[PDB]
DNA sequence: CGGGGGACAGCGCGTACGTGCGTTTAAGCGGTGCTAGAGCTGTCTACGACCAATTGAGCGGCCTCGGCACCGGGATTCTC
DNA sequence: GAGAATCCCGGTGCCGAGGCCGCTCAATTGGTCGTAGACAGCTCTAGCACCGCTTAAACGCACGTACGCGCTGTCCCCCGC
């Protein structure tokens, strides 16, 4: 099976493994490291969409948009401090 | 037709609007002319940069892409 | 189905 | 055209089902996608550098998202790499 | 006699300024962050040139902090310092 | 918030100052104000703190000038 | 006992620093205050720095390590 | 003979192509980038030696020390920039007062 | 290793009276290798963008432009046109 | 520990800011119309990478001399 | 006016800086091979300028009050020894 449903994630290894050498990153990357990150981007981006879920749902909308992102965004100060540099297009204050 | 525009376009009741959402309760007179100064100060760093990217593209018009990576560095250190 | 394995304060955003 | 947001369909799929996701929403999470990335490989291969090695392998990703990231969210998120890859790998 | 107050303050804040050792007591700080440490290892043989290093930082890093926290309280129009203009000088500098 | 066709026509003027002659994607004036506004609302946050702690309701250049030094700078 | 050292970091100490700061008047408040500001700033970027000890899996912690968690925290100090 | 004294540069300008290898900072280099980048650095180098010799002049030093390169850099607004945040061991703070403190 | 052999030949071409103490020349060291990294950072990202497998002078010398103010950029850049030019010739 | 100065609070006064109202003005949206450059593709040649040999410079160690710092004394300058 | 603090001058010590020498490694030189970049051409689209129309927003003025500023008096604390 496939190396991200080998490790049950859903993320193209692939290309990721591939983007380690298009970046210039290391002229050699072993084949835990991209898979590893592809587990830790899974996480983080879990973490944040569920709270902008809750956002949406809160405002009674499916749609999840950019407010929705900034206000989840900055109600978890761990979240908004690792993001106090990211700014949001159309996201309100 | 004697006003020029790039002052002007920034005006008294849109820097009241955004002072509200920056939660000001009120505000001296003379605060507009301090802002537009430091907006310009603000739009000329950027847009130098912007320029240079677009220049290392050798192309003459000016991308978002470009934006983004001028306001990205820049907007970080400030 | 993606639990979230952080524990962390509920939030009310409506 | 190179984007997740396929991969995000999947995991809003899998995490919120219930919400929809304006494309701006969705290249948000793009751009989003990509800082952590680049952030994360930079300081790894600056690390890697620093440690005179010409290969990334996965303590140096964990000692950089342990570096980069919140500490809790760090261990939250250290565990889920150790556990991936240790089914990867016992695969 | 005794020197009117301030007066003093003036000609020891121009020795300081021109002055440049370390003004911090440099066992005191060894210690101290040999402490500090000792939560997150259970034994590091420190560098004593790392120390020095740290030293050097936290001293410019404070005075940096002192002096804004100097020109908020002169904004505030007086002259004695507050603990509330360390707090909104850290708040303006998005160190809170 | 702030007006597309005023604001892209002074960046157009600054730009016209660095190149004199220039085109834009309307994206990266969209941008433009995204970036002017977010800065602008952070920094009116930052006085307003200045001029409570100067326990005035008025902001006062001074605050600005002040915020602007202890950030920005 | 260690922990008094953040308090044995003595009160004139600090009054030289704020001389170098070039204060002119400081209210007894302030002692603690700054105690704390440094503790956390310290205990931030000693946490980077052991992070790099151990990352090189040795228990010589190196100014360079220091170097590397300041630069990383954004700050950069010269001579090392 | 070495690369520098064709062009005229004291910087290593093997050292400098070495190091743009090693830091892999691309997959390759052309052979302009390094003397430019050694160019450069010489003249910066050369720049702020001028306002730490002046420095030490007035101090009557002919030994610049670390001192003297401070109050160059916070001398210079452009350098100052350029290091806003850059720190120096031993270096101070440049002697200033609010003269609002004065009586 | 070290760059304090080129950093005396340049401070006894603008000062050949002076002396240096040993901790600023490394206060130096330090500085000149923070400007060479600074500087191939932003021609890394340069190249990057333009998909280039390369980096040349006007990599370098349009990231240049990007490091340093205005004035000290002219002066600098002029520089380093001057010396690549005499390098092309010799 | 003592003394003095700064901080704080309260009161009065005037001006500036806020609000309302009316009229003017330009933005916002849509359509007109075109050209420039954007991007893509194909081809060819130059440039760098790689390998090998040779030579000179740089690095490391040692020695000698001079510069800087510290200490003591006297005169000048500031402060009460 | 007087006393305390600051500066200048001179001597001595101590070490660091500067120079010399020899060796080793890096830099230079030359040749080969290929691919990346540059150059040219073509096609598409998005960007630029202006008009037409509506309507809302902005501007200007007047009226009112509230807030800010300054003054005064008391009390505590911090500074200095």
Same mark, same amino acid.
């Given at each position: 099976?496939? !190396?991200?449903?080998?490790?049950? =994630?859903?993320?193209?290894?692939?290309? @990721?493994?591939?983007?380690?050498? /298009?970046? *210039?990153?290391?002229?050699?990357?072993?084949?835990?490291?991209? @898979?590893?990150?592809?587990?830790?981007?899974?996480?983080?981006?879990?973490?944040?969409?569920?709270?902008?879920?809750?956002?949406?749902?809160?405002?009674?909308?499916? !749609?999840?948009?950019?407010?929705?992102?900034?206000?989840?965004?900055?109600?978890?100060?761990? =979240?908004?401090?690792?993001?106090?540099?990211?700014?949001?297009?159309?996201?309100? $204050? | 037709?004697?006003?020029?525009?790039?002052?002007?376009?920034?005006?008294?009741?849109?820097?009241?609007?955004?002072?509200?959402?920056?939660?000001?309760?009120?505000?001296?007179? #003379?605060?507009?002319?301090?802002?537009?100064? @430091?907006? &310009?100060?603000?739009?000329?760093?950027?847009?130098?940069?912007?320029?240079?990217?677009?220049?290392?593209?050798?192309? /003459?018009?000016?991308?978002?892409?470009? $934006?983004?990576?001028?306001?990205?560095?820049?907007?970080?250190?400030? | 189905?993606?639990?979230? *394995?952080?524990?962390?304060?509920?939030?009310?955003? *409506? | 055209?190179?984007?997740?947001?396929?991969?995000?369909?999947?995991?809003?799929?899998?995490?919120?089902?219930?919400?929809?996701?304006?494309?701006?929403? +969705?290249?948000?999470? *793009?751009?989003?996608?990509?800082?952590?990335?680049?952030?994360?490989?930079?300081?790894?291969?600056?690390?890697?550098?620093?440690?005179?090695?010409?290969?990334?392998?996965?303590?140096?990703?964990?000692?950089?998202?342990?570096?980069?990231?919140?500490?809790?969210?760090?261990?939250?998120?250290?565990?889920?790499?150790?556990?991936? $890859? %240790?089914?990867?790998?016992?695969? | 006699?005794?020197?009117?107050?301030? %007066?003093?303050?003036?000609?020891?804040?121009?020795?300081?300024?021109?002055?440049?050792?370390?003004?911090?007591? /440099?066992?005191?700080?060894?210690?101290?962050?040999?402490?500090?440490?000792?939560?997150?290892? %259970?034994? #590091?043989?420190?560098?004593?040139?790392?120390? +020095?290093?740290?030293?050097?930082?936290?001293?410019?890093?404070?005075?940096?902090?002192?002096?804004?926290?100097?020109?908020?309280?002169?904004?505030? /129009?007086? @002259?004695?310092?507050?603990? &509330?203009?360390?707090?909104?000088? !850290?708040?303006?500098?998005?160190?809170?």
């Amino acid at each position: 099976k496939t !190396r991200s449903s080998r490790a049950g =994630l859903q993320f193209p290894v692939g290309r @990721v493994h591939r983007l380690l050498r /298009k970046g *210039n990153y290391a002229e050699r990357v072993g084949a835990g490291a991209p @898979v590893y990150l592809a587990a830790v981007l899974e996480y983080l981006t879990a973490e944040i969409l569920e709270l902008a879920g809750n956002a949406a749902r809160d405002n009674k909308k499916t !749609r999840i948009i950019p407010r929705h992102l900034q206000l989840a965004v900055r109600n978890d100060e761990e =979240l908004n401090k690792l993001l106090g540099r990211v700014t949001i297009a159309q996201g309100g $204050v | 037709k004697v006003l020029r525009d790039n002052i002007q376009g920034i005006t008294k009741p849109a820097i009241r609007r955004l002072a509200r959402r920056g939660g000001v309760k009120r505000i001296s007179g #003379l605060i507009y002319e301090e802002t537009r100064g @430091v907006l &310009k100060v603000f739009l000329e760093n950027v847009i130098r940069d912007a320029v240079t990217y677009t220049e290392h593209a050798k192309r /003459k018009t000016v991308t978002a892409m470009d $934006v983004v990576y001028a306001l990205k560095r820049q907007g970080r250190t400030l | 189905t993606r639990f979230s *394995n952080r524990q962390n304060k509920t939030v009310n955003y *409506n | 055209k190179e984007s997740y947001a396929i991969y995000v369909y999947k995991v809003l799929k899998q995490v919120h089902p219930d919400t929809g996701i304006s494309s701006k929403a +969705m290249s948000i999470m *793009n751009s989003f996608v990509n800082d952590v990335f680049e952030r994360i490989a930079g300081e790894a291969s600056r690390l890697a550098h620093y440690n005179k090695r010409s290969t990334i392998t996965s303590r140096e990703i964990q000692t950089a998202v342990r570096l980069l990231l919140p500490g809790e969210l760090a261990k939250h998120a250290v565990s889920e790499g150790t556990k991936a $890859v %240790t089914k990867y790998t016992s695969a | 006699h005794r020197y009117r107050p301030g %007066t003093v303050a003036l000609r020891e804040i121009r020795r300081y300024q021109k002055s440049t050792e370390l003004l911090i007591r /440099k066992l005191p700080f060894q210690r101290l962050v040999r402490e500090i440490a000792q939560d997150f290892k %259970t034994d #590091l043989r420190f560098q004593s040139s790392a120390v +020095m290093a740290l030293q050097e930082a936290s001293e410019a890093y404070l005075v940096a902090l002192f002096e804004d926290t100097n020109l908020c309280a002169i904004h505030a /129009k007086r @002259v004695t310092i507050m603990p &509330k203009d360390i707090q909104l000088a !850290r708040r303006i500098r998005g160190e809170r």
